[PDB]
Amino acid sequence: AFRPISVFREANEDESGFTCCAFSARERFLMLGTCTGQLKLYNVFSGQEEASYNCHNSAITHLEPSRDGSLLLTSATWSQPLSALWGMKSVFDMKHSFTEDHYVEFSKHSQDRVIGTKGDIAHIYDIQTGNKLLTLFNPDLANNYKRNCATFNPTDDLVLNDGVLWDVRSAQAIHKFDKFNMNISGVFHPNGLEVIINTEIWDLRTFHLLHTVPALDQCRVVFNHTGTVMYGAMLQKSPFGSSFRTFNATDYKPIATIDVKRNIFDLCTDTKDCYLAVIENQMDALNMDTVCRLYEV
């Protein structure tokens, strides 16, 4: 099941403004972005705030800590810069920013690069210098996905941008996956063998269609750290509707559908994959008053 374990809100605020979340390196501590552009650290069990840092002058949409705990990526709604990289050792400080990229992710195997998305375009940056190494856009192969989000594969040698597979080393598009939907651009399966683009599962080796999974339509997906479970939530204000779905990552078979009966802002699992944190708005409320709910997987 998904048994509720605890709940908390942005402490001492009339309107709680949590917008996104990620577990930190420290087991019991969750990092939350807020609609006023702050980063908060909370104890997930006590529900108490520990620390607060100022990141952006607009709502944080998404954040990602590095695995080693030294770095954090944030993205905001209408700030300049839209995304930034923060150092978290010694003092919390901005290292580099990515002016117009509305989404950013670390590379996966070695976290020495950032990949940012601006519309149909990907930008790769060096973490050391902040320098833009590559711009990935091919007018002949573009799918023009409206919710494109560029990403590295597990070994960092490939990028998926706008449904196009790029070889990072040569900076060449090697394959365009055919377009089946208007919005979702896709992700790599952590197994390194498959690419999941909306409802279509493609083989990375042959570029053959392996499976169709209709329940993934319009979903953002995240895997548990172990790579055994895939979580998906349909995009619908709140980025998501009121439900998320789980699937077996080995065979794409549905496990569970959870309707939390409130709009979802974000979802994450801890490094040990024991707990799920979900940001939920207290259907289609104009009032912003989010809680973080912790669930047992």
Ligand SMILES: COCCNC(=O)/C=C/c1[nH]cc(C(=O)N[C@@H](CC(N)=O)c2ccc(F)c(Cl)c2)c1-c1ccc(Cl)cc1F
């Ligand atoms: C109208 O909204 C105004 C402005 N707000 C936004 O834009 C907000 C954007 C935004 N928030 C969270 C995400 C996101 O993708 N979260 C990932 C998990 C993660 N943290 O990686 C995710 C995966 C599976 C799930 F089941 C759930 Cl519920 C969440 C996203 C998100 C949504 C769409 C895209 Cl293309 C990229 C994104 F990062």
